[PDB]
Design an enzyme around this catalytic site. Structure first.
Site, PDB file in Angstrom:
ATOM      1  N   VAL A   1       0.835  -1.184   0.000  1.00 58.57           N
ATOM      2  CA  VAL A   1       0.000   0.000   0.000  1.00 58.57           C
ATOM      3  C   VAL A   1       0.883   1.253   0.000  1.00 58.57           C
ATOM      4  CG1 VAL A   1      -1.843   1.360   1.150  1.00 58.57           C
ATOM      5  CG2 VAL A   1      -1.882  -1.186   1.257  1.00 58.57           C
TER       6      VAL A   1
ATOM      7  N   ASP B   1     -11.696  -3.593   6.025  1.00 57.90           N
ATOM      8  CA  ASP B   1     -11.275  -4.997   5.924  1.00 57.90           C
ATOM      9  C   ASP B   1     -12.420  -5.879   5.412  1.00 57.90           C
ATOM     10  OD1 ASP B   1      -8.769  -4.189   7.059  1.00 57.90           O
ATOM     11  OD2 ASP B   1      -8.745  -5.754   8.520  1.00 57.90           O
TER      12      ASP B   1
HETATM   13  O1  LIG Z   1      -3.762  -1.119   5.479  1.00 57.12           O
HETATM   14  N1  LIG Z   1      -4.414  -1.541   4.443  1.00 57.12           N
HETATM   15  C1  LIG Z   1      -5.166  -0.717   3.595  1.00 57.12           C
HETATM   16  C2  LIG Z   1      -5.271   0.755   3.846  1.00 57.12           C
HETATM   17  C3  LIG Z   1      -6.475   1.462   3.642  1.00 57.12           C
HETATM   18  C4  LIG Z   1      -6.529   2.828   3.930  1.00 57.12           C
HETATM   19  N2  LIG Z   1      -5.480   3.531   4.413  1.00 57.12           N
HETATM   20  C5  LIG Z   1      -4.312   2.849   4.625  1.00 57.12           C
HETATM   21  C6  LIG Z   1      -4.167   1.484   4.356  1.00 57.12           C
HETATM   22  C7  LIG Z   1      -5.728  -1.608   2.625  1.00 57.12           C
HETATM   23  C8  LIG Z   1      -6.588  -1.241   1.486  1.00 57.12           C
HETATM   24  C9  LIG Z   1      -6.133  -0.264   0.564  1.00 57.12           C
HETATM   25  C10 LIG Z   1      -6.920   0.124  -0.537  1.00 57.12           C
HETATM   26  C11 LIG Z   1      -8.154  -0.496  -0.730  1.00 57.12           C
HETATM   27  F1  LIG Z   1      -8.917  -0.127  -1.779  1.00 57.12           F
HETATM   28  C12 LIG Z   1      -8.629  -1.471   0.166  1.00 57.12           C
HETATM   29  C13 LIG Z   1      -7.846  -1.843   1.267  1.00 57.12           C
HETATM   30  C14 LIG Z   1      -5.271  -2.941   2.955  1.00 57.12           C
HETATM   31  N3  LIG Z   1      -5.534  -4.141   2.321  1.00 57.12           N
HETATM   32  C15 LIG Z   1      -4.933  -5.242   2.856  1.00 57.12           C
HETATM   33  C16 LIG Z   1      -4.106  -5.242   3.985  1.00 57.12           C
HETATM   34  C17 LIG Z   1      -3.851  -4.032   4.647  1.00 57.12           C
HETATM   35  C18 LIG Z   1      -4.449  -2.867   4.093  1.00 57.12           C
END
Ligand SMILES: On1c(-c2ccncc2)c(-c2ccc(F)cc2)c2ncccc21
Length: 344
Positions: free
Chosen positions: A34, A160
């Protein structure tokens, strides 16, 4: 089709539309990675996720599909929204990478654990989002303070959905990954209902009120003992409902204990909080309060508005019981990427 540019980031080449600027790594794991970014088209701080191994196996391809379907469906203030999904591929034949985009979250409920009115407002919002997701037959199954995102104004989102199931090793021992889990799912007692999530809400609400984990078990068995000390050992009625002879038989080996007085556990707490906790933390999931019933509970009288607690559009999850080949799940994922339309 927008123009993409390439950039090396947490060890892979990220290829994203020009609208997304200042990518900085914020997280990494077996799921992929991410980056934070600024979305110049919307003015939003976003999280951009690049999936790792999206189509590596049948289970992986199906999980990627499941996550995209779930995130595309969510249209609620207290639930994660899908801002964007894209791929640099120009056709199905060259389709390999999936990037998902949502609002960048900062603080979670951990970096917050409060006054009683704060607790009201936070739990109100969780239940609001739960009423929505449950109305579509979507069960979270994994609610904990770490997937509840909160901003400076105490506004909350549940995150999640469709994520890779936790491993046995991850659920082992003195770990927050298991502390909020309903006992029926923790010990695989039976087919579980939507109120597994209500049990988790009770755990989180108790922790907001006291500042302490409600059931900080050192392992599955120690945790169950902590739960049964509070809510009492099961009666015959719930015992019949535990479909595993092994589990039921083990539960029966334990000395019988009565349900404790919750006012004596949650000392000084608003009696309406205590009453709500007693109704969420019921061992028999058939008797637990639901999200919709809880929203109407006097504890929330200051926030409750029955006309501003929307339900969800129908969510077709027939795919869940479908068997398909890798390439079929991938094609369905593609179709879902291609059909995506951004929110206002
Ligand atoms: O922290 N985090 C995130 C995340 C989300 C928002 N801010 C920071 C991290 C996501 C995420 C990012 C984009 C999406 F469209 C869906 C899930 C994520 N997916 C899996 C594991 C950890 C994750």
């Amino acid at each position: 089709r927008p123009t993409f540019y390439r950039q090396e980031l947490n060890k892979t080449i990220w290829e994203v539309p020009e609208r997304y600027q200042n990518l900085s790594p914020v997280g990494s794991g077996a799921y992929g990675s991410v980056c934070a970014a600024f979305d110049t088209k919307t003015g939003l701080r976003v999280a951009v996720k690049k999936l790792s191994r999206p189509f590596q196996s049948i289970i992986h391809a199906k999980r990627t599909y499941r996550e995209l379907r779930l995130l595309k469906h969510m249209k609620h203030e207290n639930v994660i929204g899908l801002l964007d999904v894209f791929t640099p591929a120009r056709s199905l034949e060259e389709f390999n990478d999936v990037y998902l985009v949502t609002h960048l979250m900062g603080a979670d409920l951990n970096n917050i654990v409060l006054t009683d009115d704060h607790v009201q407002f936070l739990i109100y919002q969780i239940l609001r989002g739960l009423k929505y997701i449950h109305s579509a037959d979507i069960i979270h199954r994994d609610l904990k303070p770490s997937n509840l995102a909160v901003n400076e104004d105490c506004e909350l989102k549940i995150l999640d959905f469709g994520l890779a199931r936790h491993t046995d090793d991850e659920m082992t021992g003195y770990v927050a990954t298991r502390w909020y889990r309903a006992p029926e799912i923790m010990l695989n007692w039976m087919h579980y209902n939507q109120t597994v999530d209500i049990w988790s809400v009770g755990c989180i609400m108790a922790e907001l009120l006291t500042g302490r984990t409600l059931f900080p078990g050192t392992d599955h068995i120690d945790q169950l003992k902590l739960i049964l000390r509070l809510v009492g050992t099961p009666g015959a009625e719930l015992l019949k409902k535990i479909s595993s002879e092994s589990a039921r038989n083990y539960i029966q080996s334990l000395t019988q204990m009565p349900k404790m007085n919750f006012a004596n556990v949650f000392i000084g707490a608003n009696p309406l909080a205590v009453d709500l906790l007693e109704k969420m933390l019921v061992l028999d999931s058939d008797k637990r309060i639901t999200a919709a019933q809880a929203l109407a509970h006097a504890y929330f009288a200051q926030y409750h508005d029955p006309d501003d607690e929307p339900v969800a559009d129908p969510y077709d999850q027939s795919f869940e019981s479908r068997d398909l080949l890798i390439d079929e799940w991938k094609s369905l994922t593609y179709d879902e990427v291609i059909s995506f339309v951004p929110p206002p």
